């Protein structure tokens, strides 16, 4: 159950580099006057679908989607560029879904340059109470000729997966997914996900130190055995089948932290889901691999031990933590770090992580919009 809307598309269907079919919005029943435009310049790193066309808004504009009630992935696709004669500099706008502000004075141009991406996918988890999802694009008034645009819109059905421990999430809290990592493994494209069209990304660009540890992969004879009550779609087999650990030398592992850093917007509470699965055949018992998990240099799990959590090799497991980052304005770094805990003299001195998902949670105002990041 999904809608892949290629805003400003041509008449005929186009498939992207992941074998997904996108439909044009040009005469669709989702429009509620805007202009259509190819992007002026091309980037070889940017797919053609849906990024080489946009719909351009010089005044407020609402898409309406007939949907079943329930929770939704809403994913918005932006390739900053010149559209309809207007340079990417002049694009500043807001996006509202009912009570929630998803974007506010959003600059795709400045956000892309800060993060060194050529294009932007914004992912939101929202609950639609009724039979329609309305999303309103509103150019800022502040620059006199400011405009809004969008390259594509995706709406996907989902179970209630990410709901309810600081270092309640429910029907009324919207999320923005800011990160999703397959730790120790490869990228997973949306169509290789478990039916939720989530992108998982290799974790290596986020490792802080020179301490990259080592990748580990499940043996081919090992099955990933989700327990009854943990849905198999919580994360793909390839997330749990791969992991990063610290290395084979105990003395080295005692002297560094396996560390990942994530740029986040200040002023929000963050949900961090950590995924685990003991992938080494050499590890089957309690007190063989025991480690401490630090979030933002604070103890979050004193003695994580995946066999004590899962009872057995090759069993997928996850745990959620909420982080309240320090008082701030702009962007700051969120620190995740693993370190062996030798106090109970485990057999090895090592740590383990298989995946991570990080979500911004909305403030009480219904806001999810942060500031635009500043380039280096």
Asked if 324 contacts 271 with a C-beta cutoff of 8 angstroms, the reply is: no
State the burial class of residue 59 (Cβ atoms within 10 Å of its Cβ: 0-12, 13-18, 19+). exposed
3-state secondary structure of 340: strand
Looking at the fold, whether 145 and 221 belong to one and the same domain comes out as no
**Taking the mean position of all CA atoms in its chain, how far away is CA 203?**
12
Q: Where are the alpha helices (DSSP H) in 186-312?
A: 237-240, 250-253, 306-310
Contacting residues for 6 by C-beta, under 8 A, at least 6 apart: 14, 22, 23, 24, 25, 49, 50, 53, 151, 152
Q: What angle do CA 24, 148, 131 make, to 5 degrees?
A: 55
Which tokens in the block code for residue 245?
Answer: 């650990």
Which tokens in the block code for residue 285?
Answer: 């018992």
Q: Which of 158, 173, 207 is the last residue of a domain?
A: 158
CA distance 349 to 255: 11
How far are the Cα atoms of 64, 144, 204, 209, 247 from residue 252, in angstroms, in the given order?
Answer: 56, 58, 20, 13, 8
Q: What is the Cβ-side half-sphere exposure of residue 114, based on CA atoms within 13 angstroms?
A: 15
Q: Give which of 6, 160, 155, 198 is closest to 67, Cα–Cα.
A: 155
CA distance 91 to 103: 13
How far are the Cα atoms of 146, 251, 315, 361 from residue 247, in angstroms, in the given order?
Answer: 52, 10, 22, 35
Q: What angle do CA 358, 363, 369 make, to 5 degrees?
A: 70
How far are the Cα atoms of 65, 100, 154, 313 from residue 128, in angstroms, in the given order?
Answer: 11, 12, 15, 39
Asked if 265 contacts 374 with a C-beta cutoff of 8 angstroms, the reply is: no
Cα-Cα end-to-end distance for the chain: 41
State the burial class of residue 277 (Cβ atoms within 10 Å of its Cβ: 0-12, 13-18, 19+). buried
Looking at the fold, whether 238 and 344 belong to one and the same domain comes out as yes
Q: Length of the chain in residues, anyone?
A: 376
Which tokens in the block code for residue 108?
Answer: 């795709």
Structure-solving method: X-ray
Looking at the fold, whether 153 and 167 belong to one and the same domain comes out as no
Looking at the fold, whether 203 and 73 belong to one and the same domain comes out as no
Which tokens in the block code for residue 10?
Answer: 């041509």
CA distance 346 to 354: 21
Looking at the fold, whether 219 and 243 belong to one and the same domain comes out as yes
- The angstrom resolution of this structure is 2.2
Number of structural domains found in the chain: 2
Looking at the fold, whether 149 and 166 belong to one and the same domain comes out as no
Looking at the fold, whether 149 and 209 belong to one and the same domain comes out as no
Q: Which of 158, 190, 218 is the last residue of a domain?
A: 158
Q: Which of 158, 174, 191 is the last residue of a domain?
A: 158
How far are the Cα atoms of 94, 190, 236, 241, 256 from residue 9, in angstroms, in the given order?
Answer: 22, 21, 32, 38, 51
How far are the Cα atoms of 72, 283, 312, 334, 363 from residue 306, in angstroms, in the given order?
Answer: 31, 10, 8, 24, 33
Looking at the fold, whether 176 and 139 belong to one and the same domain comes out as no
Q: Where are the alpha helices (DSSP H) in the chain?
A: 108-115, 237-240, 250-253, 306-310
Asked if 81 contacts 39 with a C-beta cutoff of 8 angstroms, the reply is: yes
Looking at the fold, whether 164 and 153 belong to one and the same domain comes out as no
CA distance 27 to 161: 34
* Domain boundaries, position 144: 1-158
Looking at the fold, whether 69 and 179 belong to one and the same domain comes out as no
Q: Give which of 32, 34, 29, 72 is closest to 53, Cα–Cα.
A: 34
Q: What angle do CA 128, 365, 121 make, to 5 degrees?
A: 60
Asked if 54 contacts 150 with a C-beta cutoff of 8 angstroms, the reply is: yes
CA distance 160 to 92: 32
CA distance 268 to 330: 11
Q: Where are the alpha helices (DSSP H) in 228-350?
A: 237-240, 250-253, 306-310
Looking at the fold, whether 148 and 168 belong to one and the same domain comes out as no
Asked if 24 contacts 9 with a C-beta cutoff of 8 angstroms, the reply is: yes
Looking at the fold, whether 273 and 370 belong to one and the same domain comes out as yes
């Amino acid at each position: 159950e999904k809608i892949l809307l290629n805003c400003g598309g041509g008449a005929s269907n186009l498939t992207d580099t992941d074998n997904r079919i996108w439909i044009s919005d040009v005469k669709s029943k989702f429009l509620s006057d805007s202009k259509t435009s190819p992007a002026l310049t091309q980037d070889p790193s940017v797919p053609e679908v849906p990024y080489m066309t946009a719909r351009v808004f010089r005044s407020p504009f609402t898409y309406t989607f007939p949907v079943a009630s329930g929770r939704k992935f809403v994913r918005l696709y932006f390739y900053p560029n010149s559209y309809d004669g207007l340079n990417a500099t002049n694009s500043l706008f807001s996006v509202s879904f009912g009570p929630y502000t998803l974007l506010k004075n959003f600059s795709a141009s400045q956000t892309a340059e800060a993060l060194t991406y050529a294009f932007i996918i914004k992912e939101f988890v929202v609950n639609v109470e009724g039979g329609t999802l309305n999303m309103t694009f509103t150019p800022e008034s502040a620059p006199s000729n400011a405009y809004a645009f969008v390259n594509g819109i995706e709406v996907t059905s989902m179970p209630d997966m990410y709901s309810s421990t600081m270092v309640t999430i429910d029907n009324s809290t919207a999320l923005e997914n800011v990160y999703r990592l397959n730790v120790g493994g490869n990228d997973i494209s949306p169509s290789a996900d478990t039916g939720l069209y989530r992108s998982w990304y290799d974790d290596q660009p986020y490792i802080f130190g020179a301490g990259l540890g080592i990748p580990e992969t499940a043996d081919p004879n090992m099955t990933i055995k989700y327990p009854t009550g943990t849905p198999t779609y919580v994360a793909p087999v390839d997330v749990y089948s791969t992991a990063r650990s610290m290395g084979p030398t105990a003395q080295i592992n005692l002297n560094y932290n396996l560390t990942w850093i994530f740029s986040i917007d200040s002023g929000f509470t963050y949900l961090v889901r950590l995924h685990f699965c003991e992938v080494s055949s050499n590890i089957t018992k309690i007190n063989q691999r025991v480690f401490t998990i630090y979030l933002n240099n604070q103890t979050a799990e004193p003695e994580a031990d995946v066999i004590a959590w899962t009872s057995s090799n090759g069993v997928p497991f996850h745990k959620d933590y909420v982080v309240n980052p320090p008082e701030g304005n702009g962007q700051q770094d969120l620190w995740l770090a693993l370190h062996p805990n030798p106090v109970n003299k485990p057999e090895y001195y090592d740590s383990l992580l298989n995946g991570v998902e990080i979500f911004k949670m909305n403030t009480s105002d219904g806001n999810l919009a942060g500031t635009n990041p500043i380039p280096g």
